[PDB]
Amino acid sequence: DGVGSSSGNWHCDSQWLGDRVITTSTRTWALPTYNNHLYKQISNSTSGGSSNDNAYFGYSTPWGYFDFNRFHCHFSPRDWQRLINNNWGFRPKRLNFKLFNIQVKEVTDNNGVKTIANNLTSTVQVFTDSDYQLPYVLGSAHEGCLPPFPADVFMIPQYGYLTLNDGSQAVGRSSFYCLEYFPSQMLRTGNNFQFSYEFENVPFHSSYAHSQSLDRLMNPLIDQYLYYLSKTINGSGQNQQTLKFSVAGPSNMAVQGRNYIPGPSYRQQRVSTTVTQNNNSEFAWPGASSWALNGRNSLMNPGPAMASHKEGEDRFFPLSGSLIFGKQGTGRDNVDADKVMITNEEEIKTTNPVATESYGQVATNHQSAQWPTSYDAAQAQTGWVQNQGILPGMVWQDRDVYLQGPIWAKIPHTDGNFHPSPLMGGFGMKHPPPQILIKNTPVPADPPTAFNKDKLNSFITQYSTGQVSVEIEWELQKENSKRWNPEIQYTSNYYKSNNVEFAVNTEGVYSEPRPIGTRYLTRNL
Amino acid sequence: DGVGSSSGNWHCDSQWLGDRVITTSTRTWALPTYNNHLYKQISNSTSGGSSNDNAYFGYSTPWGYFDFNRFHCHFSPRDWQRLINNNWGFRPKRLNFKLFNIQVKEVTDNNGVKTIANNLTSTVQVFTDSDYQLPYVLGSAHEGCLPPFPADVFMIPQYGYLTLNDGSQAVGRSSFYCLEYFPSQMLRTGNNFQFSYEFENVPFHSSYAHSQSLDRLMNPLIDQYLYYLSKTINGSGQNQQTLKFSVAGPSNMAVQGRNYIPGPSYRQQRVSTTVTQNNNSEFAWPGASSWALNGRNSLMNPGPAMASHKEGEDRFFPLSGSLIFGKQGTGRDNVDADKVMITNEEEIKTTNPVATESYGQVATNHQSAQWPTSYDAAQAQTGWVQNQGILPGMVWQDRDVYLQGPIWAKIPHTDGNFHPSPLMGGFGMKHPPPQILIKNTPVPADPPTAFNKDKLNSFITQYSTGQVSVEIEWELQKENSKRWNPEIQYTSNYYKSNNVEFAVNTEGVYSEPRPIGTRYLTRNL
Amino acid sequence: DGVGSSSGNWHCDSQWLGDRVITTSTRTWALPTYNNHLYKQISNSTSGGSSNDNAYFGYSTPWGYFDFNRFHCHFSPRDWQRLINNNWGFRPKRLNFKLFNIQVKEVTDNNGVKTIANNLTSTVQVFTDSDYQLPYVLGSAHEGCLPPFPADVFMIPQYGYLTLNDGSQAVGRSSFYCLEYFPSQMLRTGNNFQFSYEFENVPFHSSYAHSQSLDRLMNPLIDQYLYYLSKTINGSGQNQQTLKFSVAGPSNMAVQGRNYIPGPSYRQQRVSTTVTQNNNSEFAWPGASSWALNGRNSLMNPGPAMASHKEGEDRFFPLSGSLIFGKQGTGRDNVDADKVMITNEEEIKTTNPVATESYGQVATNHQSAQWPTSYDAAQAQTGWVQNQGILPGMVWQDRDVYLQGPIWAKIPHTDGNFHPSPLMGGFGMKHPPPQILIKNTPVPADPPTAFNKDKLNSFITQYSTGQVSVEIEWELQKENSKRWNPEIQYTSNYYKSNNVEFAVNTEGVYSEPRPIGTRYLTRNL
Amino acid sequence: WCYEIQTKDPRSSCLGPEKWPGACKENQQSPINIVTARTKVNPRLTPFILVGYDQKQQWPIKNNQHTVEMTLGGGACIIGGDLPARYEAVQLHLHWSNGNDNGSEHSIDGRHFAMEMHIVHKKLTSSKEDSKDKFAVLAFMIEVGDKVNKGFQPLVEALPSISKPHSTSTVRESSLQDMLPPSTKMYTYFRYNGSLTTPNCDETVIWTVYKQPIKIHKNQFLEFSKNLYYDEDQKLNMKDNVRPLQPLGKRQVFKS
Ligand SMILES: [Zn+2]
């Protein structure tokens, strides 16, 4: 080690190993002291009034943490494209991480003359939540990840967590965590850190779209050996009761016996991009589909994976059923549609119900005649199914993943769960990549010349910077399709533009012009 | 030996062992040319131009395929009786498919006179889709199977498939499959074909009926150590409230505590075989219960497995919740009820809810006195549950299989599924028996003496015939019941009958008098 | 052997190891003859033609059986405290049962002198249904268990069972079982019996509560990179629709995107212990929430595990969604709340929906405007979800167990089930501990001197006593929590009292003053 | 088999109300004159609790030849009043005339109304019993010619689709609450044991008839008679499908 010696050599490249591909990324990461050096009780109260549904309580830790739970932190636009134009499936298998070339500096705003000098003798405290003993906040799609553009410098987000809350108050069951109550590595400028992790077995992500629909799997030339009720009345009129039966065939695919049915559903309000056909009313929250917990409602944000809209319904989108990303430079509040990128899951319409339609219809009575009393003459009545739970024989696809989307999530530690694929998309894991917490060490700075039991406070201003390196191994699923006609592929467009898509501008600013999925290749059901 | 020797013997038999039964079957088939040797695109606009619910887009191929996905193709009525009266469970284990005694013939039918000769040359191509790269149409209950009666000669059905469609139009995602893009074997007279397939791990089919009901598993002599709310308002009638509790016991089984609940449900309309108590209106489709996919509706044909009707209500049947077979010689359009055989599932009424009844009741508000709040008050209200999903602790039975019913089905290749047992009955497999595609090799007539350029459309008229054998080993699950009293068994009736059931009549026409299930033996829950 | 020689020692104790604890219990029992040595048909009619919902058909056998399917039969209150205060989980592993020190008795009830003596040459029969060929009645929370007080002497309950029934009538499918049709050991005063059983693999019971809520898993300081629909109208006026989007951040946690959702639900009516605010109506059964089976209604008892009430409203409890135990001395009919102990499951509010509230809200229409057909212009409409089945991404906890609650249950033998954790709590097992049947061998009285065909009906009056021992090893799941602040622990209260909790009174009567769950320690989600 | 208006032509020989078969010739039938002087107030009578009457859904509307009956499906039960356990709505028909003078079914103090609406509720569970109290029907009077109420508008819109007898259609979308008087007015009613207003009368109905009639526009009332017919040919309308009044007998009518 030693100041006059680095501890890392820029590693960023990517290598495709046929059925696999190794991604490597390196980045600089500036880290401030954060909340001085103290933990801070936070709560709905601290934030303010929030809301019953926005009520909380937890703690702001003076620590920071690294994050790369976004495909763009590992795959380049060209990288993705390929992956998606050539594989039916993909999944992470491992990860290797390294921090190095760390430099800690002290700042001295000499009466307006802020002066940065190197504190060669200082340290950053780093550790991983490998035993998963701390609140896991890496599965909440927050900012603070390694930027997609390698040349970009990053700031490292601050770690904070929530616990049980009664309004803005805590309960006895609430827990407090101290990260200093964990063993941690201390690094001087000559030192570095590294660790490796094995992804638990996860299902390949479906990077394809079906070329068939659940309701169209039969032979369009052969009849079924099954019959269906065709008529209930002779017709003419008056006591026409009858029971006619017919064979189901190519002419009436709708009534044919089937072995499997579409996945479950939770209806979402439909919203048109054309704000003239919508409705002159504030319905964002009022018309939102939601769920409740201990007297607190939470928007069904991603919700179950459901087709975003019917064929041609493009302009429509479920109130809260799709992932919406902000375009480069987009503001934080009340921005127009033209500032955001709304994803869609049309591909899964082959097996999943439309998010803004009922699952189907069900009988609600017993049709009858005046055969008993002259009453009881009830006509067959049916009702619409707004939300349908899991049923045997159901099949479904999960939500697609995106270059700018999340990669993994931690499955909640509970007695029971079902199909734990993270609803925002990606791979669910009981033991996902552990959190890597990092925080400099507070310099005690000036102390008094007479004993002071009061804990220290003046601490000398400092900040730290260096380089992080994450490598992830992704196993790939090749395709052996016999499709004759060419497949649909993602390609850039030749048409003379002002700036290359996914590149920097005259001001050196990067831009991801559109979200990119993974479902371009096709396969049968 | 070529053109002079046999490519096979007849076999076609059944060997029963202790815990196994291998069935063997051989039949005589005939293959026409199909599509005049050509591929053609098919759509509702081409055929019917029907409503959107029945719109479709696909392709018709000049290929045929072998179908033996029905029990009567392998089990004799007798064989079937032995099976169902002595085994609690069963499942397929392996298969041996073979083709032979191939004979290709030409057809003169010239100037009026029609003649037939053999083309000792000529070829029939055969190949299995062991890689499952072609659309699978064997799980759609189609006609074209090996005749139940061994003496019957059958014609191979034509292979066709459906892909994505928008109305009658196709989309860029639609796939065109060419069967000639698959390697295949060609066969002259004297050549034979053979392949073996091992069945996947499937659960034994439940060939039994429960001797107990989910709601009657308690000891009828002992009380519970649990209490239930018995009374609430000391009668009277002014402002009197109370909470009285009582022990749940033999006298009030209805309120006893329970560990398991009945399986899920999807209400169906109730239809009576006695057309008088039905209703003087057309409701076949209006009240049929269905589901939707990308804007298209499809009936809930044999949807979830539910008890066909309440005890002693055989006259009733769910609109589209049961399997309906056609009697021998029955027509295909608007036949009477006496011409079809409607199956039922009353055996599963011990664990599955009745198909034509609501699952149960559920509270829909908060009952309170007026004083609470002010002067509102509210009475306890409940609502019917028409469709109930899957809940923890649920228990259910699957659809029964029949001698004329399907055997297996291919589980759709999707990200997720639940209990992938085919809704029409049988065994669901990710890799079921591969499709066996078959075709006569086109033989050009006489080409011009001057080079043309275009494809040949002049061909010799030919067809092929031969024998086919299929052998399947089935594993058996025996019974070790301690039931003292005798059990119900499937039996023929001794009463005189113009004809013997499951036999040919004076004209040599084989017929199956009734559907035969598999649930006659009983065991406790 | 024979008399003069003890057959077994006492053995009653607990042994705590690191990850294991073995409990040992021994008790004194007494066994009468029962149905005068006869099997008898019983039914709703037999009892008193009970309600349709309460109709049943079955048999009563002169056999008794051993029941120790309760936690207090093995764990002392003291022992229970150590188990729940130091372990995050636990599960049964193996067991050994022993019957010993038989001793029967003659009881010559002469005139008034019932004169009891010993019949040394008498026999007791005992057998285990290790093959599970008999109706299993141990999963029905019946009385007759080994007394919690190791000093109380108890009477063996009589074994009875139910089969299929149509009203009070039986069907051909109904089964009759004769227990003498089983090999059984015969014991005299000098004989003993013993058997060992290994528990199937079951999940550890969750003996902890969550310190986080499913809707509070995000970093309270970092914003998300996902947007949500914030506004739909620019303001009041008229035609002014719009689409405004905002970043979901800490200030608006309610609308944040999430990967996992709360478990399913089946709404129950809410009841207040304060009988002034409930209602002046009888709604125990009218508004109870239930399910139907073959035309018979059965109350949804504990039903799905759902939080008993919203944080704070402890006075409320679901009509039939909680376990209610009777206090010592409490009668069986119409007892007051003060006589019973009502359990709750507030601990699961972190992941499970509140039992007496809707799961959430779902859209029900397509908001529309005054476009072509301006008379339309719909409005965002939503509907309440009272029963929600399973959906992918759902997580939940199971119902807690109790010192006075059941331990295990037999999973119904069916084709399908979901998350078969017994709804009343415990471990579900396909092959749970076998039932242990026991019976006094009949001793004919003086027969006639001339041969008679009739079966004997005169028998020497007899009854048996003796000791029983049961040992169970339990696996323990230690906790390695990093929580700083102390945890909640079960503890006795120092404040003076007339008696000691969990002890006997001046009349030697033992009592359990309250139910004790197991969820004291905490863990993150 | 037939109403008195129908048996007016030499042909179409059917049985009029004076010759109705079955148990329609007895003491308790249904249509009685309700004298408010002779009724006695019953304190137990309380306004019904209408659960499921606020939901909006499509309803099957059909020309039952004798009247227009609308299937109410499920989830519209009634638990209020002095009904034995509870009753679930199954059907909704109505009777009218050519003017608000001829009358419609029940009469209060000898006063008739333009139209009478019969919302019939079947007993929820009960048992396989032949006993009475099998139906609890609600009777609402209709007589006004001033203002149009949107509650009956979808019904009038659907009326032309079922012009011919034995024809079926569907109401677009409506709620049972909209077709009822305001809840502040549904406080006073009468209870009497009637059998049935249609042939083959069975004494199994409670007949809770409300005061305070409902108000609909005169155009809707005219459309009711104009868009419906008795026979297959559009010749004979559906004016007077009303059963003549029947003697009260010894039955005692109570008042809420
Ligand atoms: Zn009427």
Residue numbers in the entry:
A (entry chain A), B (entry chain B), C (entry chain C): 219 to 588, 588A, 588B, 588C, 588D, 588E, 588F, 588G, ...
D (entry chain R): 22 to 277
Article sentences:
Carbonic anhydrase IV (Car4) is a newly identified receptor that allows adeno-associated virus (AAV) 9P31 to cross the blood-brain barrier and achieve efficient infection in the central nervous system (CNS) in mouse models. Among the generated AAV9 variants with higher efficiency for infecting the CNS, the variant AAV9P31, which includes an additional sequence (WPTSYDA) inserted between Q588 and A589 of the wt AAV9 VP3 VR-VIII, exhibited efficient CNS tropism with 385-fold higher EGFP expression in the mouse CNS and 1000-fold higher EGFP expression in the mouse spinal cord compared to wt AAV9. Car4 is localized on the luminal surface of brain endothelial cells throughout the cortex and cerebellum, and its sequence and structure are conserved in Mus musculus and Homo sapiens. Here we report the cryo-EM structures of AAV9P31 and its complex with Mus musculus Car4 at atomic resolution by utilizing the block-based reconstruction (BBR) method.
To determine the binding details of Car4 on AAV9P31, AAV9P31 particles were incubated with purified Car4 (amino acids W22 to S277) for 5 minutes before cryo-EM sampling and data collection. The final resolution of the three-fold axis block is 2.28 Å at 0.143 cutoff of FSC. The 3D classification in BBR shows that the bound Car4 has major contacts with two capsomers, either A/B, B/C or C/A, with very similar ratios (5.11%, 5.06% and 4.89%) and conserved binding behaviors in the three BBR groups. Among the two interacting capsomers, capsomer A contributes the major interacting regions with the bound Car4. The residue Y588eAAV9P31-A of capsomer A has close contacts with the residues Q112Car4/H114Car4/V141Car4/P156Car4/L217Car4 of the bound Car4. Residue D588fAAV9P31-A of capsomer A form salt bridges with K143Car4 in the positively charged region of the Car4 active center. In region I, the backbone of the inserted peptide in the Car4-bound state is pulled toward Car4 from its native state by ~2.7 Å.
